[PDB]
Nucleic acid binder design. Structure first.
Lengths: 125, 50, 282, 91, 445, 251
RNA sequence: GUCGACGUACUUCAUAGGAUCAUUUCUAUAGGAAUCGUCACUCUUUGACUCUUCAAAAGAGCCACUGAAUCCAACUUGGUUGAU
RNA sequence: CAUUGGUGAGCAGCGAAGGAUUUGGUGGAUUACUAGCUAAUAGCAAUCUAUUUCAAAGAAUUCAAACUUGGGGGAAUGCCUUGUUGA
RNA sequence: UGACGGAGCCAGCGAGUCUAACCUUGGCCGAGAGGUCUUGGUAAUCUUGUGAAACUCCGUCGUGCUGGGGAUAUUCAACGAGGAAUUCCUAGUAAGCGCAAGUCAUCAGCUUGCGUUGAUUACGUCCCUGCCCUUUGUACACAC
């Protein structure tokens, strides 16, 4: 019944599903808040989808992320990818396309690996 | 079964994948009640049964 | 190209099943071909079917390398990756160096954290043809697996009497010219299959005076591999030994790439059967 | 064999190469009439470009590119049946 | 295959070894190597042009190579394919280097900047993404699928809003200053943008013919009856003679040949767009023909920092008072073609180089592109060449260090020197030599 | 772009909303009296506002800075931005029309002559003229290249609205009485009009310059004709040999 | 290690009596059975038509005027001396 | 403890002599506006008839016409073409 | 870059009615085979899924090596990141880390998988060491 949006963030074998919907503004990773995501030195790697665009985008929506697999740093990279492209997809579908591609421009100017992973490797020289 | 999983062809639409659904781990939810009944029953049905 | 290669292998094994299914018509069409050739009477089964003869009007104009290697045999040079098992010892890295010097058009790939499914996918979309995976036992290399990549066969061998060019002496540098090949008594159809596998990873058409040679000599299912350089004297031909020597024994040959082990086995070594040690290329 | 050039050449063979029959054999629709309805409704593209008529003949190398259009409701409901739907790329 | 446009001969033919059909190509700047990609082979075929052989087959795409382009300056190859990937190949000089850039959806029509710094790809999402080649990261994208006019066909039963037929561009092209992109596709709008600001400059409706198919977004509901539309009814047997009562259209044919053999209306689509290398225009290969769109400076008063004292009256007073440089820069600030022509012809030959040395650097591309578009058809050949000689001598270092500004104004000037002036010089040279022969030698009997 | 709408309130504050989703995006507060004109570039890069305190503000739009502010000498009643040439015109309170460009922020023309309040005005689609209408029952056309008044119409009803077509086809005026829209066609779409001022070098009045035949007797000069005549003369044998049909016609 | 002769061993091949149908009458037989200008009723089979399920997908699109149906609120009536 | 599951019981908020959903019919647009009919240089439109008939013109040895056939094989009787006998 | 002592946390492989010790001390029943109970010692990569380790945090210490018979209720073997030489190596690569399996050859004095963490430096050049190719341009223009 609610406007909701589901995205995916992947690094090596971690995978994070982020559901974004309209709400009061709560960002929850694995049930716990976002301010508990260990190893606590990469908590700003998790935070930078919020601090790159401002918390006034997150003031009206609530995100929840479920992260399985991987290790510590692969899980924080999956979390930040899921949060970033979930915010982009929510502003695409339920807010205007101008804020959509402003968010895409800001995340892509920081690093496009917030939005597109580096996936299939190696190179056979 | 492993060969069928290798040859799934992911552009596979059926009409029954509207009703049938999938849990969090990806497996198949099979409702253990009925499929001619309903699991949740209405408020006036609960009134009569109670 | 995932879907193209899957459906191409599907169509190939459909055509192969259809060939072995309708291969009786080939030989009975051969029977009525030689019955026209020498005017001898035709059997009852080939005499009363009217549809086969009125197909034979159409089919009278019908008439080595095999189905995986046949499309690009001498047309295109191979491309080989040589990789070790995982976290290899230094003598296996020296042996993989020696095998990549054995095969021309071979490079070597560092192995660690490479899953074999996405390794095979990276090879068979980067365009390589063969993969040689080498396995060791405390330095001593014990196996090599050759996988031909456009859904071709894998031949798995064990290696037995391994003496290495790094192990002997500073005898100099190798030659790396396109060698000549020698295959001694590969007589059965499995022998020709193993010959085609082992020799479509060398370049087609060496020089006639190419001064290095490499021999795969079968001695009771133990292919001795030596490599020699030569210079033809006034009285004979003088052979010097260069590069590694071993004996490989085929224990498996299946019909897919390295990743699955759901591929159909063409041959594998029945070890514990009652008549095991009585025949060769068993 | 060259007797295929008289025996096995047949309007049904040219008709099995049509787009809804290719679809139904690729399990992309449950029946040939469903495949006709879907490519009439404009869900199916070969390559990049949307194919709109049922009679389109699909060769062997050109059946690797028969997919659904992106932003298809059918593509969305198969992805959301396996809940692999990523709403970033619209489906 | 390669074509000499002097002797009109196909002198070279390149085939592969695999019997594939080629859909796009790209040549070297220093034309040693041709390169071509197919839509059924996933490889790129690299041929030498001097010898004829197949130099290489580049592999690494896992989808049909939709587009190829060589960078014009540093000669790096950029291919892009339907596996959602643009890929950059360093071919020359011992590298064999491959850099794959992934992108969001499957790519059709890559294009390459004139300086080879960046590459703009068009995707099937509907976007034009622009990437830095050397540091393989995205510089910026245009979201174009909402300023696309996708009409409704007659045969289809889904609206033009919900259609997924043509809301993407199958051909894009850079402007020669590198600042704009023209783009077209299987729709009847061609759109051009400026890539710094990523905003639509202008959208052109390529057809209003209702005889073509994808033109109208909304179809007249009078023509929709109780069984089918009235334009899908074939009234071909109501015809006066047999040769157009005949139906010889084999059924599932799209994009074959021979318009009689397809049974549908011809859809409207642009298959290739290109900018003009010399004069401020673009050509679009639609179904109706090669549509050529061009500006002209006769209309559209668009000044450049004029003030209240800058006036045509003021310019002819400065011309009559023979401050020639002040009259020329007043006419440049007016940006009025007749005034620039009037002042330009009124400056005498005695002081062309003083004026041409004292022209300010912001008015240099204006006087160069004016001299080009004037001198192609003007008769004053020695006057125009005096002006070109004075401008190239006085300010020909600024041009060389600002190449891409004067990249279409200098190509228009050497469209004048080699195409009228050199033909005249050839005629007078042949007359001089036939005179010297006819009077210097011996005709006796 | 169609994304942004701009509201200018009577307390001097521009608010920028998104047209798709309807929410406040930005809010500029420069003026203190009523904002009577807002416009923006064709590239969404610089906006220009004019209030009836007589200041034209120039803002960057992507960055939210102001680029400058220019104080005129009367309260401004109406702005029209010609968007291709980046020239906007202001109807001031001193009954002049100030034409000012947004790139370099200068007053570049100032048109005088109206006797009462300017009700409306509009640019030509090529941006060469500006047609105004005012409460002295008049409609004037100004050639802003030369800066003077081309034509004047005394019309009995006061024209309250003037709009050009976005092609050069029609002028549409709207008067005080009459429920309809009066429609005019510019004859200068079919002929060329003289930009010579009315009241109450003929080539420069008709915006042409017929290029003179040769500039100097010591200068080479080609023919006034097609360039191909030289090539036709030099090779007309082989051109006609090309042009013959492949076999002789049946006479 | 190759092909002939002899020897051995193995595989395949029969086709008769009778009836019926096949000629827009008549399949060759007299050993067989059929030539009628409709009236009604019941049972049965089939196909459309409208609505619908598995089970969705797409809407020849906009605006105006006019009628209807359902769910709320509001009012009225019956109702703990009993509604559902 | 989650439902980003169904069915209800209710608040806050929004809130001008009511609100929501669904549907049938008609009208106007869906291409760029020079009026209806007929035997038409004009008549009629309340009607063409009791002038609507004569005259003139007008007829290719083209007295040729399936540019229209799913494939293989045949064509008793037809049909086509050519010759022939007898009138 | 340590040593003690607590705490938080993160994987991917792997599912055959199949998976798994030895030597004793004694009691009781039984004809015997044996059964059942009892008992100490030795060995151990445990046992099928939950779970890893490196890592992260919080208290505490505080950085000059090892021996047996002698002597009370000091002094006689190796070794503190390994010489000359030598081998291998270019991105999820080197290296660190653990966890599973044990697939007809090989392997358990181990082998193969699987994930976790993840760089430095080349990405040029034929100068050295070598190996290879060509020395009519042929293949069709233009140019050299």
């Amino acid at each position: 019944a609610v406007p909701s949006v589901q995205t995916f963030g992947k690094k090596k074998s971690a995978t994070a599903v982020a559901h974004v919907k309209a709400g009061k503004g709560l960002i929850k990773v694995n049930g716990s808040p976002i301010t508990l995501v260990e190893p606590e030195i990469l908590r700003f790697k998790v935070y930078e989808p919020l601090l790159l665009v401002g918390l006034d985008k997150f003031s009206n929506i609530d995100i929840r992320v479920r992260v399985t697999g991987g290790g510590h740093v692969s899980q924080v990279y999956a979390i930040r990818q899921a949060i970033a492209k979930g915010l982009v997809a929510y502003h695409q579908k339920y807010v205007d396309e101008q804020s959509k591609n402003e968010l895409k421009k800001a995340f892509t100017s920081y690093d496009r690996t917030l939005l597109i992973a580096d996936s299939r490797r190696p190179e056979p020289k | 079964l492993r060969e069928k999983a290798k040859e799934r062809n992911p552009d596979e639409y059926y009409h029954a994948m509207h009703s049938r659904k999938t849990d969090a781990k990806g497996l198949l939810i099979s409702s253990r009640h009925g499929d001619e009944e309903d699991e949740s029953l209405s408020m006036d049905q609960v009134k009569l049964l109670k | 190209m995932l879907r193209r290669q899957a459906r191409e292998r599907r169509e190939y094994l459909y055509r192969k099943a259809q060939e072995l299914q309708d291969s009786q018509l080939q030989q009975k069409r051969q029977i009525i071909k030689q019955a026209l050739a020498q005017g001898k009477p035709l059997p009852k089964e080939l005499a009363e079917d009217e549809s086969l003869q009125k197909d034979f009007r159409y089919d009278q104009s019908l008439k080595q390398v095999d189905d995986e290697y046949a499309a690009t045999s001498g047309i295109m040079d191979p491309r080989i990756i040589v990789t070790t098992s995982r976290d290899p010892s230094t003598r296996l890295s020296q042996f993989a160096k020696e095998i990549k010097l054995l095969f021309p058009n071979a490079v070597r790939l560092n192995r660690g954290n490479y899953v074999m499914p996405n390794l095979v996918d990276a090879c068979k979309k980067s365009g390589t043809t063969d993969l040689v995976v080498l396995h060791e036992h405390r330095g001593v290399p014990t196996s090599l697996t050759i996988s031909h990549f456009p859904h071709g066969p894998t031949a798995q061998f064990s290696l037995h009497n391994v003496v290495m060019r790094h192990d002997i002496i500073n005898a100099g540098n190798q030659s790396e010219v396109n060698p000549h090949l020698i295959f001694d008594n590969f007589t059965t159809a499995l022998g020709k299959r193993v010959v085609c596998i082992l020799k479509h990873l060398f370049n087609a058409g060496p020089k006639k005076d190419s001064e290095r040679v490499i021999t795969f000599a079968n001695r009771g299912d133990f292919i001795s591999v030596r490599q020699h350089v030569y210079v033809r004297t006034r009285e004979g031909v003088e052979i010097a030994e260069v590069g590694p020597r071993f004996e490989m024994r085929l224990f498996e040959l299946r019909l897919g790439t390295l990743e699955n082990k759901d591929a159909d086995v063409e041959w594998q070594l029945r070890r514990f059967i009652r008549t095991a040690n009585k025949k060769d290329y068993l | 064999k060259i007797s295929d050039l008289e025996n096995k050449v047949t309007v049904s063979a040219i008709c099995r190469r049509r787009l809804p029959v290719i679809m139904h054999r690729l399990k992309m629709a449950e029946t040939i009439q469903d495949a006709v309805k879907f490519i009439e409704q404009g869900h199916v593209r070969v390559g990049p470009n949307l194919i709109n008529d049922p009679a389109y003949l699909v060769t062997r190398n050109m059946e690797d590119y028969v997919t659904w259009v992106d932003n298809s409701k059918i593509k969305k409901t198969l992805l959301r049946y396996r809940n692999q739907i990523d709403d970033f790329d619209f489906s | 295959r390669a074509w000499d446009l002097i002797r009109y001969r196909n002198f070279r033919t390149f085939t592969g070894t695999e019997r594939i059909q080629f859909n796009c190509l790209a040549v070297d700047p220093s034309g040693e190597v041709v390169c071509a990609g197919s839509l059924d082979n996933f490889d790129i075929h690299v041929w030498s042009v001097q010898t004829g052989q197949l130099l290489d087959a580049l592999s690494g795409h896992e989808g049909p190579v939709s587009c190829l382009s060589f960078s014009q300056e540093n000669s790096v190859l950029a291919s892009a394919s339907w596996d959602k990937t643009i890929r950059i190949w360093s071919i020359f000089g011992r590298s064999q280097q491959v850099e794959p850039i992934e992108v969001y959806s499957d790519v059709l029509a890559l294009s390459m900047r004139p300086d080879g710094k960046e590459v703009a790809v068009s995707t099937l999402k509907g976007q034009i993404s622009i990437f830095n080649i050397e540091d393989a990261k995205q510089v910026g994208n245009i979201d174009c699928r909402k300023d696309i006019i996708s009409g409704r066909f007659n045969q289809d039963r889904f609206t033009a809003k919900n259609s997924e037929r043509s809301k993407f561009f199958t051909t894009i092209h850079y402007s020669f200053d590198g600042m704009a992109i023209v783009a077209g596709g299987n729709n009847n709008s061609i759109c051009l943008y400026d890539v710094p600001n990523e905003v639509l400059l202008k959208r052109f409706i390529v057809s209003r013919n209702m005889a073509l198919n994808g033109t109208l977004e909304f179809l007249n509901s009078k023509k929709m009856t109780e069984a089918g539309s009235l334009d899908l009814i074939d009234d071909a047997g109501e015809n006066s003679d047999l040769e157009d009562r005949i139906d010889n259209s084999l059924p599932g044919s799209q994009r074959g040949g021979d318009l009689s053999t397809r049974k549908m209306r011809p859809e409207v689509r642009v298959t290739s767009v290109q900018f003009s290398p010399t004069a401020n225009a673009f050509a679009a290969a639609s179904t109706e023909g090669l549509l050529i769109y061009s500006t002209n400076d006769t209309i559209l008063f668009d000044p450049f920092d004029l003030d209240v004292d800058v006036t045509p009256h003021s310019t002819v007073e400065a011309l009559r008072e023979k401050q020639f440089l002040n009259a020329l820069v007043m006419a440049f600030r007016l940006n009025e073609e007749y005034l620039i022509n009037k002042v330009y012809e009124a400056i005498p030959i005695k002081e062309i180089p003083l004026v041409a040395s004292n022209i300010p650097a912001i008015y240099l591309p204006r006087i160069l592109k004016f001299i080009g578009d004037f001198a192609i058809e003007s008769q004053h050949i020695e006057f125009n060449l005096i002006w070109i000689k004075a401008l190239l001598s006085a300010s020909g270092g600024y041009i060389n260090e600002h190449k891409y500004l004067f990249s279409t104004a200098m190509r228009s000037i050497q469209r004048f020197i080699v195409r009228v002036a050199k033909e005249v010089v050839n005629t007078t040279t042949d007359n001089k030599y036939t005179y010297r022969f006819l009077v210097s030698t011996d005709g006796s009997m | 772009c169609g994304n942004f709408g701009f509201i200018g309130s009577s307390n001097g504050s521009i608010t920028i909303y998104n047209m798709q989703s309807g929410i406040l995006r930005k809010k500029y507060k420069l003026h203190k009296r009523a904002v009577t004109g807002i416009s923006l570039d064709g590239m969404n890069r610089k906006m220009v506002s004019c209030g009836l305190d007589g200041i034209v503000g120039f803002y960057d739009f992507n960055k939210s800075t102001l680029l400058g502010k220019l104080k005129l000498d009367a309260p401004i009643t109406a702005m029209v931005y010609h968007r291709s040439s980046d020239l906007f015109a202001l109807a001031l309170d001193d009954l002049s029309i100030v034409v000012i460009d947004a790139v370099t922020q200068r007053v570049v023309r100032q048109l005088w002559g109206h006797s009462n309040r300017i009700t409306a005005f509009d640019f030509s689609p090529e941006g060469r003229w500006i047609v105004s209408a005012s409460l002295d029952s008049t409609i004037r056309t100004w050639d802003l290249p030369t800066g003077g008044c081309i034509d004047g119409i005394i019309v009995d009803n006061v024209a309250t609205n003037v709009k050009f077509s976005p092609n050069g086809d029609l002028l549409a005026t709207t008067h005080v009485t009459g429920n309809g829209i009066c429609i005019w066609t510019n004859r200068a779409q079919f002929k060329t009009v003289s930009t010579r001022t009315i009241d109450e070098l003929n080539d420069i009045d008709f915006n042409t310059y017929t290029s003179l035949e040769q500039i100097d007797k010591e200068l080479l000069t080609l023919s006034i004709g097609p360039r191909s005549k030289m090539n036709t003369l030099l090779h007309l044998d082989v051109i006609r040999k090309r042009s013959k049909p492949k076999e002789a016609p049946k006479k």
